[PDB]
Write a protein that binds this ligand. Sequence first.
Ligand SMILES: O=C1CCSc2ccc(Cl)cc21
Lengths: 103, 138, 87
Amino acid sequence: MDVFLMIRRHKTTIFTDAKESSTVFELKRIVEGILKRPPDEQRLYKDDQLLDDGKTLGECGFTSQTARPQAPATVGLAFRADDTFEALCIEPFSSPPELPDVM
Amino acid sequence: VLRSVNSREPSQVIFCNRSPRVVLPVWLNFDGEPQPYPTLPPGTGRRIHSYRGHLWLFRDAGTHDGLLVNQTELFVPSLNVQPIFANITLPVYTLKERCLQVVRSLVKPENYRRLDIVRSLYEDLEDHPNVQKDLERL
Amino acid sequence: MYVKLISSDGHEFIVKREHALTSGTIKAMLSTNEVNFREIPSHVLSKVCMYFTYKVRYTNSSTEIPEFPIAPEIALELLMAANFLDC
Ligand SMILES: O=C1CCSc2ccc(Cl)cc21
């Protein structure tokens, strides 16, 4: 089954899909093709939990019923400077304005 | 020009509502006039006595948003080789039309002109889905 | 294969080029691989991208199509962007 994802770092968001059986490392290869950084320089998170390279997306809890096309699951991404990984962080999106009085 | 054919040959059908909307079935009579039938709750089914060559379309009972039936917009009962299934589903609306549905559901039509958007959106919001409008067509 | 859509507040959304060419307006602003949307903030543009994935996934599949969700708090800005992009 396909799982639909948002890979997020800072002010960057990748919309992509993958198989439930594919691995965290294979997801890192997708990020590598897009952001041109090797897996060794990447760490992926489900919320605050660091994800292991050999694990399939389904075992890290990305399932077809939670990672949906109109509501994709978020994968956190952190990069490595020289040595040393930066901490994980994701800039939130902007906030909607106060709902008009109409409505 | 779009009407039921008075075949007088019975055709046995299942209305299956595979949508999250309350579905209003509409029969086009032998004069082309739309005739509403009782509504179908979401995820429910109902079995119907119809005739070969009759014309049905389906709509959101509250808003008249168009729905699909076995894909395509019209369902015409055929020969029962036993009952024919009419699977009623959401279309993939455009993002524009889907926003109009949500906004219309939150704003009373009095106050459409109180929202701050281009004037062309006032006309788009006020132009409600309508079966007679959709019936206008070659 | 991928293109970058940038929201008014600087968030960068990276989607498949085919998903982005679903919008005639985006096809023109590319016909470069980056598009800047001076008028569309990130809480709207993220929904636009979710819609691309939803449309590509569910056009022509006759299974059962779920409703595309739109929170009331974003409905009007989303309509404004959808109207401009002819989405
Ligand atoms: O999404 C928005 C939100 C703020 S107002 C606006 C005006 C024009 C266009 Cl294209 C988009 C938008």
